[PDB]
Symmetry: D2
């Protein structure tokens, strides 16, 4: 199934792109929300950018664990990798949305 | 310990206060953005009611190995409720962010 | 974009099905893990089934809030609905996996 | 309150103990299922190290409105660490479940 089905493969790649675009939108909107509540507060935007950088490193480290049993480059590996990236990105997007609403 | 017991109870209270604040601020955000949109307040209220039912059902699963009415069960129950509440608060804060 | 693109629409529906199948697998495996650690403990499997039932009700209630600004039946609504179902299902699957590992 | 301060600190300790247990049990599950698979223990260790760096970076964002070194900042810091730890523990428990 995942080892051979074109739509499973194509949609895993496609949904990773959608999840990444939605995360970028969430990040961009958090910056604007934080600026609305706090102005360009000293260190704030740099701290948000630094955290997001470390997050992207974690995302990749965790996806290397989650996909450890799959063969790099295989259909199954790409689907697993892409699903992991999408899910992790969705969860990060939710977290960034939640931060803008801390009053 | 009296202290494990007291802190588990206190931290549940704190988590529920923050959840209530997240809920109230969501309602205000939604009204700000969408006004008296038909059904909107009612959908949010209904969802949160079902959530509290899930919270108790999941906590009954998580505490299954403890003896109900025991101090240990109550610590475990409070800890589960607190964590579930924190997760729900994050989710409500994430809603109506556009 | 989401209002008109076929692949966005098709992959949102497809990934909802994948997420639901993965959740069912996680649920089925939790039952087996709980049985391995505790046997058919009085009330345990019924409590797990009851919780999952309420969860499915919550999933739908929450997705009705998340999609409130979209028009029922529209491309945008279906994509939003399906993405919400998929994300909620992924998060539930992770939670059920985590429960089997509570020692 | 001395009690808010003490419970926030205590609950951080509890959350970190449960996270360490989740981490240790994950390692045991992984060894049970995959043996000395090349790179596997090292990948899990490396990921958890990066996670602790993210935890501190995100907590610095969450506590940005408080004065560092203040009792209020430390309560807020401990609460953030505890919740982040609980979330990580759930995630590690979810790994190697097949």
């Amino acid at each position: 199934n995942v080892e051979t089905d074109q739509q499973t493969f194509a949609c895993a790649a496609f949904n990773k792109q959608v999840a990444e675009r939605e995360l970028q939108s969430a990040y961009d909107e958090l910056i604007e929300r934080m600026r609305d509540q706090f102005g360009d507060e000293a260190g704030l935007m740099s701290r948000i950018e630094a955290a997001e950088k470390v997050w992207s490193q974690l995302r990749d480290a965790d996806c290397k664990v989650e996909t450890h049993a799959e063969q790099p480059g295989s259909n199954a590996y790409q689907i697993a990798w892409n699903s992991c990236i999408a899910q992790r990105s969705d969860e990060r997007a939710e977290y960034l949305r939640s931060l803008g609403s801390q009053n």
